[PDB]
Amino acid sequence: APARPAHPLDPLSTAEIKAATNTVKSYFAGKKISFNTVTLREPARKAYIQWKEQGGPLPPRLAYYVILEAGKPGVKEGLVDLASLSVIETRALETVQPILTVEDLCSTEEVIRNDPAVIEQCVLSGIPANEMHKVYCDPWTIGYDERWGTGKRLQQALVYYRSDEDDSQYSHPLDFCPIVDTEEKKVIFIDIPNRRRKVSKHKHANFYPKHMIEKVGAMRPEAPPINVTQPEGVSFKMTGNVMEWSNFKFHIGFNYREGIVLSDVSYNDHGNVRPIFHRISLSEMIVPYGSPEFPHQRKHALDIGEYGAGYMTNPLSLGCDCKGVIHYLDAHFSDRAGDPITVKNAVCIHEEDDGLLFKHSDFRDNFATSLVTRATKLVVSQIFTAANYEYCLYWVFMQDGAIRLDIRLTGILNTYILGDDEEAGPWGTRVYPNVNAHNHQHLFSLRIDPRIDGDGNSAAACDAKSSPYPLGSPENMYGNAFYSEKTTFKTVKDSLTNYESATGRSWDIFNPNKVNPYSGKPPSYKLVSTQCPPLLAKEGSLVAKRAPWASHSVNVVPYKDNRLYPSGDHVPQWSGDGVRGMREWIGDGSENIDNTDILFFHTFGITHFPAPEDFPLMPAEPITLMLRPRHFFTENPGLDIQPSYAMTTSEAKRAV
Amino acid sequence: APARPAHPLDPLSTAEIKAATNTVKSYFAGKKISFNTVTLREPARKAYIQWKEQGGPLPPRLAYYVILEAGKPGVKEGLVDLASLSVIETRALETVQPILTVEDLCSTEEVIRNDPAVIEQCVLSGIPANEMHKVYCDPWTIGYDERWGTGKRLQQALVYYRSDEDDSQYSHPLDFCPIVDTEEKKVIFIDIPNRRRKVSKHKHANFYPKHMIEKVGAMRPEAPPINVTQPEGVSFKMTGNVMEWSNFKFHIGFNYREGIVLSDVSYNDHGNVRPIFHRISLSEMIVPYGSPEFPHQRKHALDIGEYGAGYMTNPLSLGCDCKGVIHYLDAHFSDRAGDPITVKNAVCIHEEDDGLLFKHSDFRDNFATSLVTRATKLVVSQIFTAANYEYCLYWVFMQDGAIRLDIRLTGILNTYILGDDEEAGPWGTRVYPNVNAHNHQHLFSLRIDPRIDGDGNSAAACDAKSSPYPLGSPENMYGNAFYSEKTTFKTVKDSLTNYESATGRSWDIFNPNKVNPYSGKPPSYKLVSTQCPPLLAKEGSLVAKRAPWASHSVNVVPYKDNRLYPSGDHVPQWSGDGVRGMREWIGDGSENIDNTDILFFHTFGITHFPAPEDFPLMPAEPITLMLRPRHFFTENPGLDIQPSYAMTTSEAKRAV
Ligand SMILES: [Cu+2]
Ligand SMILES: [Cu+2]
């Protein structure tokens, strides 16, 4: 049996992966199978907490697998008990399709380049038959197409042309969309538009230094360096995957889908170690495009569930992606053959300056009496590439006890062809000649499993409101009175809430069993998040049905085990009909969520209307949200940090 | 005559200040006068642009002054022509009161400590008569009190007790409020509550290291250092107050009121130097409190117009407030005697790493084909202290051509006393025993005088909207279609708009005379700003009347000279009645603002519901907004910056 991990939440080692895939091959001996997913099945929440805090049973070390079998529809999935090298649960799911791996994305180009119907369309589009090596595709999942459902595993090949291998292809989309059976390795259909648009004759819109020298004359000279050193080392301590820093303690996990998973998050409040979150991660996304024209409705990528923030994560880049003194973690997955694969340097961990933590000075001696303390932040990060997009993910811990998630979006716009006299608006932007960059949103589902100061939690909306008493009344003489209206969610239905600019809405995750001795309020972490777009696709749309979580900024449901992925476990090609994922968890909306084990799913992101500044490669666009302690502590928790400068009134008088 | 400045927008030198005050003293010879304000009167916008870009006349170098005269109500104000040492304009304003200086804050404590009625109240409150040296006050402007109007110059002494001079006084407010005549140096009234609350007998809530060692046992050890150096110097160049960095060029100005003023802001687009803004600054604030109980309606500080972001600015570190390699500017004002005073190191300028600028990698070779470029940002900052508050102001320029304003709020909560059995809610929070920190908002008025790619500009609201065609229609078959609805403001009235979470509203400031050759849209800078609270005080309230700008997120008016301060030129003790400031500029709402010289005033900020984490000293709370180029450039303007790492497809194949 494989050696068991240092910690029950540690991701599967390479040896554990191989042990799992050997087990599964033996169970299916005589069958031709391929591996889609081999990943840790995390322990039940109860089992973990009981092991960690109550001297309870050691949870079994289990691997979840998804396989395909040649000639069989759908997938099989199950669990392997690693200690006994045995399959302990298995089932066949003939009517779902699974996440697409890097191998799956790389496989489609050879299919389309050799398909006679595709060749014919390249030629009709102005690319000669002997130049197929110049044709490339981003082979998305089909997403959903009602002509096939889940009956075949399908990709849509978004086709482009490169004049030279070093080109950025996105200036030269083609007009047609081959549909490919991923498992049969064949083109089954090609969507061809009513109006044909041949390949752009313009130069490629390129962005490496050699290209830029041709385009603008010269690169800027190298700027003088800004160097960042920690000559006495770092202040954080890692014990395997467990982090300790500035009184925070937590486990850094990682998987094929979510990427970074932070677990067992506590804060050491002068010797009282107080839980905050059991688990926090990104659980799904949707990137819905806004052109109604066929087949563009199929562009609504659920990037986490369809590609994976782990599978697609970048090996980060000795001193370029992450600047400073860095601790790296590697990621391990299975390939289709059942062999472990490694992404080196998938996670970067470091501490960085974060400006001022607090300051106050006294006007009475011209600010001679003064105290200033600088902030340090701890950053746990990854960058994943989902075809054209780059998503830079930064989990940030702060010395006031706040935790923030910062995202920067970069990469390249998804582009489609635009005719010489064709107008892109209102659904997209002409960002370069013959290039239409369609409107789209990027929405994310943050999953919080809280344990604010322990178990038994609730959530609330907090709305700023003027007093209901009018100006000139004895209760509100001058019309200034205002308060925070807290609406505690009692049932699931109550939770289904949007951000509201009219009230500056925030949400509290709180422990109703405890009370701050000063304020009288429950200890809480407050979600402060304003990048909360409405879902623009209509009710009942394909987008709305496949992402039931995205229609509210906040969804709060009862905890149950295995409630991770809110668009279901196998996302590609689901029509959005059925009681699964968030739609299952919400149910009829009547279940209790007050003072219990809850899961808080937050929808946040941006609406992107492309502009030429975004092309050919887009400058980073920031998204953030923060979880802030409010009524958790009885005073500013950073005041024991040594100030950078401190002078008292008495000391200022003595300096004369 | 004083030597003329290097640049017409340079603030008055110390010699110019003295020259101006000598001129005014001579004009008023035989009269007993004191100086309130002596500051640059900036050139008219037409005159500046003509001088800068058209070989036009050199604008006269002018000083604006505000003086008080013993025995005369209100103020006198006027202009001095420095070249001729003469008063060129003067007028008496008998019914206004002016900004309170540092000297004016410092003067009140000696008055109240020696006043028999105040002493009596201290004794009734539990502080013996021989301990008046332990009584302190923050002597705000009265703000507005209908019992006196502007008929006397008045301060309200928010009173506190210190057990030792090194204490933070804010745990020990007293229950009463002396009203002080600033110019007569006497207490004229004391507001006494119906419910007396004697001084707290608790320990002070303190925050220096010596205090914290007593409170929690020990300070944390010094963390290992993070060192930032620039061994080959910085990439920016300053010529006097003119900055050049990453193709931006602008003038760094400073005054008593607004603090930092950025002017003549352009971007050098490969040799084509394109204007962006004529002037950008913070022009006013309001910090309205939410307790209706008398006299707390008088807490609605207009910090900029009542105290001044320049007058109240901190002399910065060095090495503590601003980390790294810093260029500092000093600030110069007049004191009451007409002598120049200096705040050393009032502004800090430096460049800092700002993470990734952009990245893209190709999945086809497992991300071997990759380009990553790191961002640098340029930061122009100050910190001002308005009694209890600290406001950290950062104007940030970025290498994608965006400009951001970042603010961090810190300092100390304003507190009032709380009885042992008194409930603070719903209008405040008990943050420590016997301490009530009332609810309040912090609202700011960002003033933008734009020149987007030159003169003749417009503004618009941009709202994301679903297509009006329903799901299932030929126009919107799958219900996903969406667009940006642009509402161009034709008249002032049209511009009076709020942030709307329902549409993810942004605003464009654009040049309708020009067209992006790719997109077809006008060049613009887009305001991306979501920390846009409603004003919670009711229509017709004292707050809403004194801050007419604050009731909309956006106000756009025609440019005229001297339209700087949207709550009027002399803010303290204005009732809010009258056609002045923003209310004058809005007029009847009918004036054209489409394709003309416009002023864009943006209201943003936060609503603060205190919690114990904020006490006794508050961790920094961030506020931000961004102005982003959209359709300004025809491609990402940063692509000529040398990448940190770049490998092409061909290079990756050659590396084997
Ligand atoms: Cu996008
Ligand atoms: Cu505040």
mmCIF file of N, CA and C in Angstrom, chain A residues 455-520:
data_model
loop_
_atom_site.group_PDB
_atom_site.id
_atom_site.type_symbol
_atom_site.label_atom_id
_atom_site.label_comp_id
_atom_site.label_asym_id
_atom_site.label_seq_id
_atom_site.Cartn_x
_atom_site.Cartn_y
_atom_site.Cartn_z
ATOM 1 N N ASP A 455 -18.327 25.681 15.286
ATOM 2 C CA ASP A 455 -19.450 25.183 14.537
ATOM 3 C C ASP A 455 -20.801 25.732 14.931
ATOM 4 N N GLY A 456 -21.671 25.784 13.955
ATOM 5 C CA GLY A 456 -23.018 26.302 14.139
ATOM 6 C C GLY A 456 -22.908 27.759 13.691
ATOM 7 N N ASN A 457 -23.216 27.966 12.410
ATOM 8 C CA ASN A 457 -23.068 29.295 11.791
ATOM 9 C C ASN A 457 -24.344 29.653 11.068
ATOM 10 N N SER A 458 -24.481 30.961 10.797
ATOM 11 C CA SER A 458 -25.547 31.551 10.030
ATOM 12 C C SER A 458 -24.970 32.588 9.065
ATOM 13 N N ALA A 459 -25.836 33.017 8.138
ATOM 14 C CA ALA A 459 -25.464 34.113 7.236
ATOM 15 C C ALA A 459 -26.542 35.150 7.189
ATOM 16 N N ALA A 460 -26.165 36.347 6.756
ATOM 17 C CA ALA A 460 -27.089 37.483 6.753
ATOM 18 C C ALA A 460 -26.689 38.423 5.616
ATOM 19 N N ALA A 461 -27.684 39.120 5.108
ATOM 20 C CA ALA A 461 -27.434 40.382 4.317
ATOM 21 C C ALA A 461 -27.445 41.570 5.224
ATOM 22 N N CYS A 462 -26.543 42.515 4.968
ATOM 23 C CA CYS A 462 -26.424 43.735 5.736
ATOM 24 C C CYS A 462 -26.635 44.907 4.748
ATOM 25 N N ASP A 463 -27.677 45.692 4.973
ATOM 26 C CA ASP A 463 -28.075 46.760 4.119
ATOM 27 C C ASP A 463 -28.023 48.090 4.854
ATOM 28 N N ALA A 464 -27.267 49.073 4.359
ATOM 29 C CA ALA A 464 -27.331 50.390 4.957
ATOM 30 C C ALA A 464 -28.666 51.082 4.604
ATOM 31 N N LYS A 465 -29.365 51.624 5.588
ATOM 32 C CA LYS A 465 -30.620 52.213 5.416
ATOM 33 C C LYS A 465 -30.743 53.494 6.226
ATOM 34 N N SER A 466 -31.364 54.518 5.642
ATOM 35 C CA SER A 466 -31.768 55.712 6.389
ATOM 36 C C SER A 466 -32.802 55.263 7.394
ATOM 37 N N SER A 467 -32.879 55.957 8.500
ATOM 38 C CA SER A 467 -33.978 55.766 9.427
ATOM 39 C C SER A 467 -35.315 55.915 8.674
ATOM 40 N N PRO A 468 -36.360 55.123 9.098
ATOM 41 C CA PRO A 468 -37.649 55.283 8.466
ATOM 42 C C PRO A 468 -38.409 56.540 8.925
ATOM 43 N N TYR A 469 -37.913 57.199 9.967
ATOM 44 C CA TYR A 469 -38.575 58.405 10.494
ATOM 45 C C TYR A 469 -38.145 59.565 9.635
ATOM 46 N N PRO A 470 -39.060 60.473 9.372
ATOM 47 C CA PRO A 470 -38.765 61.469 8.373
ATOM 48 C C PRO A 470 -37.943 62.631 8.979
ATOM 49 N N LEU A 471 -37.355 63.418 8.099
ATOM 50 C CA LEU A 471 -36.736 64.695 8.456
ATOM 51 C C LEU A 471 -37.701 65.524 9.262
ATOM 52 N N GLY A 472 -37.262 66.108 10.371
ATOM 53 C CA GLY A 472 -38.090 66.950 11.145
ATOM 54 C C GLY A 472 -38.903 66.264 12.193
ATOM 55 N N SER A 473 -38.813 64.955 12.261
ATOM 56 C CA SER A 473 -39.513 64.232 13.314
ATOM 57 C C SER A 473 -38.658 64.243 14.587
ATOM 58 N N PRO A 474 -39.256 64.035 15.764
ATOM 59 C CA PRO A 474 -38.457 64.004 16.976
ATOM 60 C C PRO A 474 -37.380 62.911 16.936
ATOM 61 N N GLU A 475 -37.636 61.840 16.162
ATOM 62 C CA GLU A 475 -36.749 60.703 16.056
ATOM 63 C C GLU A 475 -35.589 60.941 15.095
ATOM 64 N N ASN A 476 -35.740 61.923 14.218
ATOM 65 C CA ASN A 476 -34.780 62.131 13.098
ATOM 66 C C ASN A 476 -34.791 63.607 12.709
ATOM 67 N N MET A 477 -34.504 64.487 13.663
ATOM 68 C CA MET A 477 -34.825 65.909 13.496
ATOM 69 C C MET A 477 -34.154 66.476 12.252
ATOM 70 N N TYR A 478 -32.885 66.148 12.084
ATOM 71 C CA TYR A 478 -32.052 66.658 10.994
ATOM 72 C C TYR A 478 -31.869 65.714 9.837
ATOM 73 N N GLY A 479 -32.564 64.583 9.852
ATOM 74 C CA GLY A 479 -32.628 63.741 8.719
ATOM 75 C C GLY A 479 -31.413 62.901 8.440
ATOM 76 N N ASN A 480 -30.495 62.832 9.395
ATOM 77 C CA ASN A 480 -29.207 62.149 9.204
ATOM 78 C C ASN A 480 -29.132 60.712 9.655
ATOM 79 N N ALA A 481 -30.109 60.256 10.449
ATOM 80 C CA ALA A 481 -29.976 58.960 11.067
ATOM 81 C C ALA A 481 -29.914 57.824 10.044
ATOM 82 N N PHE A 482 -29.017 56.900 10.294
ATOM 83 C CA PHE A 482 -28.913 55.689 9.461
ATOM 84 C C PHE A 482 -28.345 54.522 10.233
ATOM 85 N N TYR A 483 -28.691 53.331 9.752
ATOM 86 C CA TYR A 483 -28.321 52.118 10.470
ATOM 87 C C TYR A 483 -28.051 50.974 9.456
ATOM 88 N N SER A 484 -27.575 49.850 9.979
ATOM 89 C CA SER A 484 -27.373 48.633 9.166
ATOM 90 C C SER A 484 -28.485 47.680 9.457
ATOM 91 N N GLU A 485 -29.306 47.379 8.458
ATOM 92 C CA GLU A 485 -30.349 46.418 8.564
ATOM 93 C C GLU A 485 -29.790 45.035 8.301
ATOM 94 N N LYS A 486 -29.821 44.182 9.305
ATOM 95 C CA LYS A 486 -29.294 42.829 9.129
ATOM 96 C C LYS A 486 -30.496 41.880 8.891
ATOM 97 N N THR A 487 -30.510 41.165 7.770
ATOM 98 C CA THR A 487 -31.534 40.175 7.498
ATOM 99 C C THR A 487 -30.857 38.817 7.625
ATOM 100 N N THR A 488 -31.113 38.119 8.731
ATOM 101 C CA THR A 488 -30.552 36.778 8.892
ATOM 102 C C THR A 488 -31.330 35.794 8.057
ATOM 103 N N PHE A 489 -30.604 34.953 7.346
ATOM 104 C CA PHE A 489 -31.275 33.989 6.485
ATOM 105 C C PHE A 489 -31.746 32.799 7.313
ATOM 106 N N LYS A 490 -33.029 32.500 7.279
ATOM 107 C CA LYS A 490 -33.542 31.363 8.052
ATOM 108 C C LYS A 490 -33.624 30.122 7.213
ATOM 109 N N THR A 491 -34.138 30.237 5.980
ATOM 110 C CA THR A 491 -34.207 29.116 5.055
ATOM 111 C C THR A 491 -33.397 29.431 3.803
ATOM 112 N N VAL A 492 -33.058 28.425 3.014
ATOM 113 C CA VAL A 492 -32.297 28.606 1.786
ATOM 114 C C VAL A 492 -32.857 29.721 0.949
ATOM 115 N N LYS A 493 -34.171 29.768 0.773
ATOM 116 C CA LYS A 493 -34.786 30.779 -0.090
ATOM 117 C C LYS A 493 -34.428 32.168 0.320
ATOM 118 N N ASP A 494 -34.370 32.400 1.631
ATOM 119 C CA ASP A 494 -34.041 33.725 2.119
ATOM 120 C C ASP A 494 -32.644 34.212 1.670
ATOM 121 N N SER A 495 -31.735 33.270 1.482
ATOM 122 C CA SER A 495 -30.352 33.588 1.144
ATOM 123 C C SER A 495 -30.103 34.088 -0.268
ATOM 124 N N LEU A 496 -31.014 33.785 -1.157
ATOM 125 C CA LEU A 496 -30.805 33.979 -2.631
ATOM 126 C C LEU A 496 -30.925 35.478 -2.896
ATOM 127 N N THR A 497 -29.775 36.143 -2.871
ATOM 128 C CA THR A 497 -29.680 37.608 -2.778
ATOM 129 C C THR A 497 -28.609 38.096 -3.723
ATOM 130 N N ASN A 498 -28.812 39.301 -4.231
ATOM 131 C CA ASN A 498 -27.851 39.974 -5.042
ATOM 132 C C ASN A 498 -27.183 41.113 -4.343
ATOM 133 N N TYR A 499 -26.022 41.492 -4.836
ATOM 134 C CA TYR A 499 -25.404 42.732 -4.388
ATOM 135 C C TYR A 499 -26.342 43.871 -4.778
ATOM 136 N N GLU A 500 -26.459 44.878 -3.940
ATOM 137 C CA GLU A 500 -27.328 45.999 -4.212
ATOM 138 C C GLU A 500 -26.543 47.252 -3.906
ATOM 139 N N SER A 501 -26.292 48.041 -4.939
ATOM 140 C CA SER A 501 -25.623 49.310 -4.757
ATOM 141 C C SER A 501 -26.470 50.258 -3.913
ATOM 142 N N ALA A 502 -27.791 50.134 -3.948
ATOM 143 C CA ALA A 502 -28.665 51.073 -3.228
ATOM 144 C C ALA A 502 -28.486 50.998 -1.725
ATOM 145 N N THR A 503 -27.931 49.887 -1.219
ATOM 146 C CA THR A 503 -27.762 49.698 0.258
ATOM 147 C C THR A 503 -26.325 49.411 0.593
ATOM 148 N N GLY A 504 -25.421 49.420 -0.398
ATOM 149 C CA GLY A 504 -24.046 48.955 -0.197
ATOM 150 C C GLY A 504 -23.966 47.590 0.450
ATOM 151 N N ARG A 505 -24.783 46.678 -0.038
ATOM 152 C CA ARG A 505 -24.978 45.399 0.587
ATOM 153 C C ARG A 505 -23.651 44.645 0.895
ATOM 154 N N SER A 506 -23.504 44.144 2.121
ATOM 155 C CA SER A 506 -22.436 43.178 2.436
ATOM 156 C C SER A 506 -23.166 41.952 3.008
ATOM 157 N N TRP A 507 -22.433 40.872 3.217
ATOM 158 C CA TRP A 507 -23.004 39.726 3.849
ATOM 159 C C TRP A 507 -22.123 39.281 5.028
ATOM 160 N N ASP A 508 -22.739 38.831 6.084
ATOM 161 C CA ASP A 508 -22.061 38.311 7.261
ATOM 162 C C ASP A 508 -22.174 36.821 7.338
ATOM 163 N N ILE A 509 -21.062 36.183 7.633
ATOM 164 C CA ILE A 509 -21.059 34.784 8.091
ATOM 165 C C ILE A 509 -20.652 34.806 9.522
ATOM 166 N N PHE A 510 -21.567 34.339 10.375
ATOM 167 C CA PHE A 510 -21.443 34.594 11.814
ATOM 168 C C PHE A 510 -21.772 33.377 12.652
ATOM 169 N N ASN A 511 -21.375 33.416 13.935
ATOM 170 C CA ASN A 511 -21.676 32.346 14.862
ATOM 171 C C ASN A 511 -22.707 32.903 15.868
ATOM 172 N N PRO A 512 -23.969 32.515 15.741
ATOM 173 C CA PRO A 512 -25.084 33.041 16.574
ATOM 174 C C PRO A 512 -25.002 32.521 18.022
ATOM 175 N N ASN A 513 -24.056 31.634 18.257
ATOM 176 C CA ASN A 513 -23.896 31.043 19.599
ATOM 177 C C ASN A 513 -22.954 31.832 20.461
ATOM 178 N N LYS A 514 -22.342 32.893 19.928
ATOM 179 C CA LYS A 514 -21.295 33.613 20.650
ATOM 180 C C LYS A 514 -21.606 35.080 20.581
ATOM 181 N N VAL A 515 -20.947 35.836 21.455
ATOM 182 C CA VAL A 515 -21.202 37.233 21.550
ATOM 183 C C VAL A 515 -19.885 37.972 21.820
ATOM 184 N N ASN A 516 -19.612 39.052 21.101
ATOM 185 C CA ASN A 516 -18.462 39.931 21.385
ATOM 186 C C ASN A 516 -18.719 40.645 22.695
ATOM 187 N N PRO A 517 -17.772 40.573 23.629
ATOM 188 C CA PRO A 517 -18.077 41.197 24.939
ATOM 189 C C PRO A 517 -18.165 42.691 24.967
ATOM 190 N N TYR A 518 -17.613 43.316 23.939
ATOM 191 C CA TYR A 518 -17.771 44.758 23.810
ATOM 192 C C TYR A 518 -19.009 45.179 23.071
ATOM 193 N N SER A 519 -19.172 44.729 21.819
ATOM 194 C CA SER A 519 -20.261 45.227 20.992
ATOM 195 C C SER A 519 -21.568 44.566 21.190
ATOM 196 N N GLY A 520 -21.540 43.372 21.736
ATOM 197 C CA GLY A 520 -22.754 42.576 21.895
ATOM 198 C C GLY A 520 -23.237 41.843 20.675
#
